[PDB]
């Protein structure tokens, strides 16, 4: 019988913002990133 | 005081001379070189947007 996975619930809260900036011979390759913290929530997940 | 009329009529050739002045001074090359001021300009950088670092495994 096939196992099946189910459930899983979390919530995203704001944690911060970041600016990554790679450099390659005086030219800039930038990227804005949003970091979110997590807070779990019902229903719990379970592999059946 | 009548001498002004005589002077104008006599010196009218300077009108054509002045026409030459202006219509060849225009022909001559001029370049007013507006500056950049003492304060110097600069742009940010060549900036390109990309996806950030990915945590592969």
DSSP letters of B1-57?
Answer: -THHHHHHHHHTHHHHHHHHHHHHHTTS---------SSPP-----EEE--------
* Per-residue tokens: B19: 């026409």
Q: Considering Cα of B45, then B50, then B55, then B57, what sign does the dihedral take?
A: negative
Tell me, in Å, the resolution of the deposited structure.
Answer: 3.5
Q: Quick one: CA torsion of B13, B14, B19, B24, rounded to 10 degrees? A: 110
PDB experimental method: cryo-EM
Q: For residues A10 and A39, is the Cβ–Cβ distance under 8 A?
A: yes
Q: For residues A13 and A37, is the Cβ–Cβ distance under 8 A?
A: yes
What is the distance in angstroms between the CA of the first residue and the CA of the last residue of chain B?
105
Cα separations in angstroms, A23 against A18, A30, A32:
16, 9, 15
Contact residues on chain B for A33, CB-CB shorter than 8 A: 52
Q: Considering Cα of B3, then B5, then B10, then B16, what sign does the dihedral take?
A: positive
The Cα B28–Cα A39 span in angstroms is 78
- Backbone region of residue B10 per phi and psi (left: phi > 0; alpha: psi in -120 to 50; beta: other values): alpha
| Length of chain B measured in residues | 57
Q: Which of A18, A20, A29 sits opposite B48 (nearest CB)?
A: A29
Q: For residues A25 and A38, is the Cβ–Cβ distance under 8 A?
A: no
Chosen for mutation from A22, A34, A35 (greatest number of chain B CBs closer than 10 Å) is A22
């Amino acid at each position: 019988a096939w196992p099946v996975i189910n459930g899983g619930a979390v919530s995203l809260h704001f944690a911060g913002v970041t600016l990554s900036t790679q450099f390659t011979d005086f030219v800039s390759l930038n990227s804005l990133r949003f970091r979110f913290s997590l807070t779990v929530d019902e229903p719990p997940f379970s592999i059946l | 005081a009548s001498l002004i009329y005589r002077q104008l009529l006599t010196n009218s050739y300077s009108v054509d001379l002045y026409d030459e002045i202006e219509q060849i001074g225009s022909g001559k090359t001029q370049n007013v070189t507006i500056n950049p001021g003492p304060f110097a300009q600069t742009r940010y950088a060549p900036v390109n947007w990309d996806h950030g670092e990915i945590n592969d495994s």
